Design an enzyme around this catalytic site. Structure first.
Site, PDB file in Angstrom:
ATOM      1  N   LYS A  67       0.072   0.826   4.730  1.00 49.52           N
ATOM      2  CA  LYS A  67       0.480   1.604   3.563  1.00 49.52           C
ATOM      3  C   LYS A  67      -0.599   2.596   3.151  1.00 49.52           C
ATOM      4  CE  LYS A  67       3.766  -1.567   1.289  1.00 49.52           C
ATOM      5  NZ  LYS A  67       3.852  -2.264  -0.022  1.00 49.52           N
ATOM      6  N   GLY A 128      -3.152  -8.250  -7.021  1.00 51.28           N
ATOM      7  CA  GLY A 128      -2.833  -7.911  -5.646  1.00 51.28           C
ATOM      8  C   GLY A 128      -1.344  -7.706  -5.521  1.00 51.28           C
TER       9      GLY A 128
END
Length: 269
Positions: A67, A128
């Protein structure tokens, strides 16, 4: 019935899932679109992305661990991906690769859909996964009262500093209206499957429980919120809406709510 003019849309991940291949292909069929979808993997993100362009592939979802590593190879990073410096969607416009983050878009959309009150106090548990997308979505929706509760102190403090919020290492003395879970707590198969993402006393005092965990929908957090008559937002809604937004980017059609629900049901199986 594939032909030479059929457009390919796809995903790249270190561990491909069947969700998108099932979901997108169902919708192409129902909408009469000459498109096919398939998940792929790679050990060379550079040549995978350069491949998407060279082969005229229309659309590519991006998952871990690509990503951020895909970004040097794209032509234009749109504000959704800029907001969290992470890309989950590429659209190929005649060789010009435009990058988006539909997790961010989905969260912004759900905040709006559920008419969440920007004056309300928010606590995000976790630092996260989807934490950054969640925190940024709240910030850009005008929420000024948000705290990040997380066990990773440095990452927690970073996220708070980056978005102008505060970090807390515990829930003592704290009240909040909107509780968001972005940890693995409640995840099927995890060591924390049967744990609460927030204490009952906290949930009792809140008005909204938003769990980004998608499997199961009914985490202990969500189930308890429902047992106390609180508003809930489940991670399944996030996964579906982020996929819908990709579909619309690639095809220029937003499927109806009825077809999305059938597709989502088809793909959970």
């Amino acid at each position: 019935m594939i032909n030479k003019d059929t457009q390919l849309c796809m995903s790249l991940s270190g561990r491909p899932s069947n969700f998108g291949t099932t979901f997108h292909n169902y919708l192409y069929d129902k909408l009469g679109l000459n498109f096919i979808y398939k998940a792929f993997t790679t050990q060379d993100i550079e040549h995978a992305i350069k491949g998407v362009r060279a082969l005229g592939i229309r659309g590519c979802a991006v998952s871990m661990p690509f990503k951020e590593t895909c970004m040097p190879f794209l032509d234009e990073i749109h504000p959704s991906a800029q907001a969290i410096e992470s890309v989950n969607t590429i659209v190929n416009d005649n060789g010009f690769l435009r990058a988006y983050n539909t997790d961010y878009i989905a969260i912004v959309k759900l905040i709006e859909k559920y008419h969440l009150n920007k004056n309300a106090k928010v606590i995000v548990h976790g630092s996260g996964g989807m934490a950054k997308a969640v925190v940024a979505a709240f910030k850009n929706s005008g929420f000024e009262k948000l705290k990040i509760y997380a066990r990773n102190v440095k990452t927690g403090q970073y996220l708070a500093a980056l978005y102008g919020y505060a970090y807390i290492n515990s829930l003592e003395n704290q009240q909040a209206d909107i509780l968001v879970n972005v940890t693995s707590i409640g995840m099927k198969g995890g060591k924390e499957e049967m744990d609460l993402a927030f204490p009952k006393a906290f949930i009792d005092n809140a008005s909204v429980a938003f769990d980004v965990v998608a499997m199961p929908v009914e985490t202990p957090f969500i189930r308890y919120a429902q047992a106390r008559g609180k508003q809930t937002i489940s991670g399944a809604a996030v996964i579906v809406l982020q996929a819908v937004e990709q579909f619309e980017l690639y095809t220029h059609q937003r499927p109806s709510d009825e077809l999305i629900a059938e597709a989502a049901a088809f793909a959970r199986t």
